[PDB]
Design a binder for this molecule. Structure first.
Ligand SMILES: Cn1c(N2CCOCC2)nc2c1c(=O)n(Cc1ccc(Cl)c(Cl)c1)c(=O)n2C
Ligand SMILES: Cn1c(N2CCOCC2)nc2c1c(=O)n(Cc1ccc(Cl)c(Cl)c1)c(=O)n2C
Ligand SMILES: Cn1c(N2CCOCC2)nc2c1c(=O)n(Cc1ccc(Cl)c(Cl)c1)c(=O)n2C
Ligand SMILES: C[S@](=O)(CC[C@H](N)C(=O)O)=NP(=O)(O)O
Ligand SMILES: C[S@](=O)(CC[C@H](N)C(=O)O)=NP(=O)(O)O
Ligand SMILES: C[S@](=O)(CC[C@H](N)C(=O)O)=NP(=O)(O)O
Ligand SMILES: C[S@](=O)(CC[C@H](N)C(=O)O)=NP(=O)(O)O
Ligand SMILES: [Cl-]
Ligand SMILES: [Cl-]
Ligand SMILES: [Cl-]
Ligand SMILES: [Cl-]
Ligand SMILES: [Mg+2]
Ligand SMILES: [Mg+2]
Ligand SMILES: [Mg+2]
Ligand SMILES: [Mg+2]
Ligand SMILES: [Mg+2]
Ligand SMILES: [Mg+2]
Ligand SMILES: [Mg+2]
Ligand SMILES: [Mg+2]
Ligand SMILES: [Mg+2]
Ligand SMILES: [Mg+2]
Lengths: 476, 476, 476, 243
């Protein structure tokens, strides 16, 4: 409930030199420009500020370029990195003529989703808790040419380096490198990132995050995870974007490089963005029933029914990259089919063991990753869950087994996760009505998304020969 | 019509030291072992020779390993490369108990296809003329690891080398390199492979090939093509396998390395295997009608109808690799949709301009490549064409335009070529009855093929991150 | 007057293994493919041979690709370079349906030009003598990237190398390098290319050229010139193409690299293609009049009038590249304005001093270079000259001065040569009627030429920053 | 004048902050091939007695007659005006389609592909202005600002009407629609030639004199146009080595 004057006071008290104006592009990267403290006045709140909509992905064409920005005082935070004292604020994108909210502003979609939820009477609050895992690498390089292509990531703790004569700077190999699938979570010196993760935890604390934990993750070569307290949809998506900024730049300032890509390593764990979800109304929880499987109420079970039913199109917003589908393979604690199960890290929806406290009851949607847009992803998940409640969609029976080790004939009788991005985009195009309910998603957004993924991602990868095709086929 | 005694005479006259026993594996690579001249006797013809069927792809399991081979005297040729005088002969694979022909011997499939054609009364001879294009490279390297993957091909004439300070051996850069899409076909010194191609042409002539032409092809970095006289199905497939052997080894002996892979270069022409086809009966041609479009008879037009109708599954045998589908992209004289058209190198079936001579009338099926098995590919094409004649399948009207430059709304009303290998394999699995006619293809062959491609090709590429995913997604 | 049977006899007597089928693309590079001797029969003369017209510049589109070739027995010569005995023959391009000559075959244009000349009654023979100068370099490299671009040529005799510690192979610098503008023409060891030019002279003699001289030219870094006997238009253009092939490949086989580009060196002489021209009728010369300036008849003077009047558009075919206009600068024995003058190497047309022999009387058109198509260039020159005779166009008075030393106010009073390629192309577009007389050039040819130069040459150079722009402007 | 003085000092401060911090800055129009050039867009407005003159609620893009005629002058005089606003050989490598720089002489509101864009500023009359997108930083801001003003003033004085605004992506216009629109000049030699032929609007009131104009023309020809013209381009070797 922060006000314009609250932000002006914060700026004065902190002796801010610059204000960094931020907003979200369609794919999911934050955009920014800087104004001096002297130019940060009431006119910023009253009239807004302009930018070139044609240079932003999924936004405007060149002849309709000018767009407008209006501040969100809830999102004002001091930047931990800039030597000149800087205040970061997120903005909403508006039409420069009518001052109406932009149909392709991701932050608007989240706003609309929250208001639609209230309008259904089902609940008044949707809580999102997320676990954005990442890799702390030392280096990366890659190219793509007519006659060749390559990539390489590297990290001191990568198992591929056990036989190295020296480290990259010429210093001795001192062992204690992380085995593949072996990073979760031995003490130092096996864990070579303790001090860096502490700096990440501290930078988050100093940016107003309420912290829960930090640890090394399963993957070799510096996989990590940090958890902060859940929040309502829009706040949670704003938290995600700032979290990624703080992780990436703490690493950068300390000589490292971070990636949130779903699957940077072949034959080791990918990086997921599990989303814990619950609905509340009038300050009371709605997910709990002592007599249901895994202690779940009807509302909760139908929300799951919606998620698993809509998955074939929903993944276009929750798993939105070509790389996403290299993670959805068996053996790495990511989903390979559409089942819910308690305590089950091989499942698509896991129900965490929380006991008899009704407040703690929730579902963990394990399918999503961090390769896209949290505003759009959280919103799409909500729309799928709500369609499930409204149409009382029953999920198929929980399967309490290692889903990777299912016998072939039982495995076949269960719907699989989509194989590739082109499949989920096709399915989104064919069936997206649940998303357009209440105008939360509009057709122009959905069509822009489909077009962007095909032209900029699917096709560019499809036309380029893969290095493994040379391993397979050079001698045909 | 060569006999056992004809081959024994050839071996004696040529003072042969060794006999190289050859046969075809299922994917399409020739296999061999050597016996001394003293061990080449009538018993080889009467009893045959044994091998380990479990070490050959698409053949036997380990407990049913032993298999038998019986010579085909038509295929006896002197090897141009071995210092010790060697006679090469192709063999048919047989069951070691019953002496029945093997259901998964590619050379048997071709045999069966030819006999089935005769049994239909439609014709007695199917002629296949093929153009197997290739690249004459200088080097290749590639790998696939947990944290990285690469490939690189290289050639002195590659345009990517115009700015090189020196050649690979340290000698000066002397220019005259080939522009992308610019290799067809300037005189030397632009054409840096004239003498090598002459050696290829001579080695073919000395192996009993009847030669027609040789030239540099469109692609930079040493693309080439050589044409030899067409023949009946089985002979033509045998010719193809020996041709590839002679091309590869002439190159090898002269310090080069050749690939027949469909698309080794990104942004330059792929290498195709166009198949010219015609049916004959009682020594008379069946493809010609003065009054048809492009001078085609009903029999010819229905054969085309069969090819274009069955394409979605047929390509599993004619375009059988993951790399195949990197070639089926617009702008490189390869098909992108299922149309026939005269004079048209952008089409799926081109009708060459041959004039009023009825003997010369034929179709050019431009879709196939050299990345698989010519015995299986020629056979499958025939089966599709015959199903077309038998069911009088009418092809959709010819389109006499640049098919790459079609307006979006006309382009959509035409069936496209398949996007990827997994699609054609799926389609083969669902619909393959035309192939099983007369038992030419059997279900065990089709099921083995589908299984091999999924487990050994489709899945291995799908699980491995592509270098371009790092270009697109590292900073998500 | 060679016949098909004359060529068959030559092939048999020389024990030819291969026949190289050659034809000219529109810009001016010879194209080829090879057939075995066994495939060289009467059918080649009767039916011709096919090729892909869509892969040849200025020819066909992809849907109308098939084209036909018919041999010219006058052009059969033994190849001096190929280890396998080869006979080269030039072909005419024909329509594959109607067998009519192709409107965009350069060799057809020359054919038509010769026949048109006869039809005018003016003369029956146009003689062309050409001097194609060239550089014998050691190496060349160049590229063009987003952030940088370079070229470098090199030669042992280049003056830029006088201070080199060693030669490229590590051997000592032994001096005797050529000074800029100092190559014409000191004895060896200053002249470092005597033996190589002797090899060029011998290869030409053995290919049926009648030789006149060879020498080093003005430019440092191995400039050279060889002269062979003049001939009638078509024969002369065929001679030029073969001469360029023999020069380039003699160099290549001897460790060097040759360029015919107009201006490879900045601040030293360009390479021209001076064209000596005369008209004859009934075996009698037409250029001579004892009483005319420089001994020229009215016919000759009007031919010159035509050349100088039509120059602004004519240079589109005689000086057809962007690089052409780097040579048309003062101080290097190339034209900078449109004057004729006897004995004058600074003029556009020089009249060589030949004495009172009427047979030797001729004009030297000094403007043309070797960067395009001799068939088109010779033809266009003839058409301009004939328009001059027909309309009795009077050239402006001869100027017997060093045209590089004129003060700027006096320079201005004479029409200048065009500054850049875009200007001559524009002018060709606006005025080309003299070329279309008798259908020698057709509109489709002229329009294709204009389009090719704009899209493939003019525009690509215009959009790319020049290195010297960085010298001038980095610090603006 | 103050604005031109500001420009010069700004360039000094940018270049030397970079220098002191291990970097190197260029203001050249097109240092990268296949990526955006660097422009110097000039927003312009006329005021009198402390009141704005560019605004009319009823005009297209909210422009008064004075403003529209100023634009008429800019687009009419462009063929010679660019000699002072786009004064280098490199300037014309930026004037190519696809990079938010002009390729023809149109004005249009909200349009970053246009020669003059009218920024969206609302109903406040004080904020009303034109953005002349053609100029770059490769020359002289004193001369460039002055020449723009002289062109705009000739437009007002002779009430020169600009051709109708075109509200489209101007790089994507169909063949014959684009062909009815005057293009921007191709190269420096063309604008210098045109300046030589027609420069009367500049000499009004003796703001520019003939000795200045003649010195400018002479300098560009001898020191820039000719030195580039005589030097072979690396791409000529890519195109022509094997002719
Ligand atoms: C621990 N947690 C996480 N974290 C799991 C670990 O990673 C951080 C998010 N996400 C949660 C929860 C979580 O506890 N709940 C339930 C919930 C919701 C509202 C209230 Cl007032 C209360 Cl007291 C509890 C939730 O509804 N969500 C979404
Ligand atoms: C020239 N050609 C090629 N070549 C095209 C160029 O590459 C080599 C194959 N393939 C052909 C043909 C080809 O001509 N024919 C027709 C054919 C068939 C049988 C006879 Cl007896 C005769 Cl005389 C002609 C055909 O039926 N096929 C299949
Ligand atoms: C020496 N020369 C050269 N060469 C000049 C030096 O380089 C080689 C060409 N070109 C000539 C001439 C040349 O002499 N003539 C005149 C000419 C024409 C026909 C006859 Cl039958 C005779 Cl005998 C003389 C000509 O008409 N042309 C075109
Ligand atoms: C240990 S893990 O199960 C691993 C998740 C894996 N990285 C993935 O979702 O791809 N995550 P958590 O226990 O934090 O939910
Ligand atoms: C010149 S091309 O059209 C090129 C074919 C291309 N390489 C392909 O099929 O991929 N082949 P051809 O003219 O020999 O049939
Ligand atoms: C010595 S030169 O005058 C030099 C010509 C110069 N290379 C040119 O035309 O560019 N040629 P020639 O005397 O052979 O006619
Ligand atoms: C984003 S841009 O449109 C880019 C302009 C480009 N650099 C040019 O004018 O060349 N500039 P702005 O939005 O600052 O006016
Ligand atoms: Cl995909
Ligand atoms: Cl696939
Ligand atoms: Cl030009
Ligand atoms: Cl210029
Ligand atoms: Mg966790
Ligand atoms: Mg985790
Ligand atoms: Mg989790
Ligand atoms: Mg061919
Ligand atoms: Mg080919
Ligand atoms: Mg072909
Ligand atoms: Mg000479
Ligand atoms: Mg000379
Ligand atoms: Mg001369
Ligand atoms: Mg601007």
């Amino acid at each position: 409930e922060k006000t314009p004057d609250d932000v002006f006071k914060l700026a004065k008290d902190e002796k801010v030199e610059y204000v960094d104006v931020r907003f979200c592009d369609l794919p999911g990267i934050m955009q920014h420009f800087t104004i001096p403290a002297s130019a940060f006045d009431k006119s910023v709140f009253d009239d807004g500020l302009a930018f070139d909509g044609s240079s932003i992905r999924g936004f405007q064409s060149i002849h309709e370029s000018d767009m407008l920005l209006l501040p969100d005082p809830e999102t004002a935070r001091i930047d931990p990195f800039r030597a000149a004292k800087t205040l970061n604020i997120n903005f909403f994108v508006h039409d420069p003529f009518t001052l109406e909210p932009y149909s392709r502003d991701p932050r608007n979609i989240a706003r609309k989703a929250e208001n639609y939820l209230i309008s259904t009477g089902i609940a008044d609050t949707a809580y999102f808790g997320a676990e954005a895992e990442f890799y702390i690498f030392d280096s990366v390089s890659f190219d793509s040419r007519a006659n060749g292509s390559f990539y390489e990531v590297d990290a001191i703790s990568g198992w591929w380096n056990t036989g190295a004569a020296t480290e990259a700077d010429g210093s001795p190999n001192r062992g204690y490198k992380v085995r593949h699938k072996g990073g979760y979570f031995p003490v130092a010196p096996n864990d070579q990132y303790v001090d860096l993760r502490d700096k990440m935890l501290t930078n988050l604390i100093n940016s107003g995050f309420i912290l829960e934990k930090g640890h090394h993750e399963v993957g070799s070569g510096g996989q990590a995870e940090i958890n902060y307290q859940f929040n309502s949809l829009l706040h949670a998506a704003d938290d995600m974007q700032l979290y990624k900024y703080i992780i990436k730049n703490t690493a950068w300032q300390n000589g490292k490089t971070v990636t949130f890509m779903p699957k940077p390593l072949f034959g080791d764990n990918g990086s997921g963005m599990h989303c814990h979800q619950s609905l509340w109304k009038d300050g009371a929880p709605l997910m709990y029933d002592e007599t249901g499987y895994a202690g779940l109420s009807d509302t909760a079970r139908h929300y799951i029914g919606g998620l698993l039913h809509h998955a074939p199109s929903l993944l276009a917003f929750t798993n939105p990259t070509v790389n996403s589908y290299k993670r959805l393979v068996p053996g790495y604690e990511a989903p390979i089919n559409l089942v819910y199960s308690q305590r089950n890290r091989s499942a698509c929806v896991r129900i965490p063991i929380t006991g008899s406290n009704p407040k703690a009851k929730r579902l963990e949607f394990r399918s999503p990753d961090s390769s896209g847009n949290p505003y759009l992803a959280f919103s799409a998940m909500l729309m799928a869950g709500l369609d499930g409640i409204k149409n009382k969609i029953e999920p198929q029976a929980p399967v309490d087994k290692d889903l990777y080790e299912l016998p072939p004939e039982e495995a076949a009788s269960i719907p699989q996760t989509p194989t590739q991005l082109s499949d989920v985009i096709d399915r989104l195009e064919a069936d997206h009505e649940y998303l357009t309910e209440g105008g939360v998603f509009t057709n122009d957004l959905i069509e822009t998304w489909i077009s962007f993924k095909r032209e900029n991602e699917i096709e560019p990868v499809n036309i380029r020969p893969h290095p493994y095709e040379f391993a397979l086929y050079y001698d045909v």
